[PDB]
């Protein structure tokens, strides 16, 4: 499958002479697997999945060392950004980074990512070629000039093509596994001879899922209400979709649930 790794990094400055808070979270196939947080008592990378509990302390120590590197890089960056944007002291600001790689089932790099944001907005980002930068901003042009002069891209490309790929591969051997949705449809009054039908999917992992409603064959993309997929809190996810239908016409409507843990898409209707 289209395996991925990401590192999501955040530094947040706060008023009153405090150092910036730095948090890095590592993800493999969208599951959080490591985390470092400067606010902790002993700042170090920690395992956040049990399949990481098999790495020796040299892994944690290496990664923790990189984190102290990033903290500092982020801290100086944050200060520069203040100046680039002509901003006052005693405010609160965020610098975020996303990094990582996409892999094929042949273990071959598909896409590499490296993107920064300031205050939650694109600042600069390495393009797909892994050679050139797209600056969002006036400020970011100055950063782009620095990184073109310096060859920074080469550094990030080598990381994305080498280390990122090799380590994603290792982390996966270390770990495929899914939980299928349990689906049901609930019935809810409205007035004016109308009824809400709500198709629920629960207990599913991974979080990617598609719910459709059919009126006797035809898909109701338009009249359908969704909610954003949400965590149940136990590792699994939840989603529902609903349509308003005429009273008595309920059996004409069919819910379909598509999920990669399923041998067939589920198909279901309101059952009184």
């Amino acid at each position: 499958g289209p395996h991925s790794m990401r590192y999501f990094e955040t530094a947040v400055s706060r008023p009153g002479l405090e150092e910036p808070r730095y948090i890095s979270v590592g993800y493999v196939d969208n599951k959080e697997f490591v985390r470092f947080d400067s606010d902790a008592e002993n700042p170090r990378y920690e395992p956040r999945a049990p399949w990481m509990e098999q790495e020796g302390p040299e892994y944690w120590e290496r990664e923790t060392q990189k984190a102290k590197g990033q903290e500092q890089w982020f801290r100086v960056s944050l200060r520069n950004l203040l100046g680039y944007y002509n901003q006052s002291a005693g405010g609160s600001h965020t610098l975020q980074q996303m990094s990582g790689c996409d892999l094929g089932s042949d273990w071959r790099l598909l896409r590499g990512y490296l993107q920064f944001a300031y205050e939650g907005r694109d600042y600069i980002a390495l393009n797909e070629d892994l050679k050139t930068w797209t600056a969002a901003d006036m400020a970011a042009q100055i950063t782009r000039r620095k990184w073109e002069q310096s060859g920074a891209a080469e550094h990030y490309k080598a990381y994305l093509e080498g280390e990122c790929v090799e380590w994603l591969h290792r982390y996966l051997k270390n770990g495929l596994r899914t939980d299928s949705p349990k689906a049901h449809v609930t019935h809810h009054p409205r007035s004016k001879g109308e009824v809400t039908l709500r198709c629920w999917a629960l207990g599913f992992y991974p979080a990617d899922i598609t719910l459709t409603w059919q009126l006797n064959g035809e898909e109701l993309t338009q009249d359908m209400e969704l909610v954003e997929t949400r965590p149940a809190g136990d590792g699994t996810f939840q989603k529902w979709a609903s349509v308003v239908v005429p009273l008595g016409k309920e059996q004409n409507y069919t819910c379909r649930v598509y999920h990669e843990g399923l041998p067939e898409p589920l198909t279901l209707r309101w059952e009184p």
Binding site: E9, G26, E63, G69, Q70, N80, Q97, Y123, Y156, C164
Partner: peptide
């Protein structure tokens, strides 16, 4: 294994 950003910073 995460990235180690090179200088220059932002």
């Amino acid at each position: 294994s995460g990235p180690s950003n090179t200088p220059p910073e932002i």
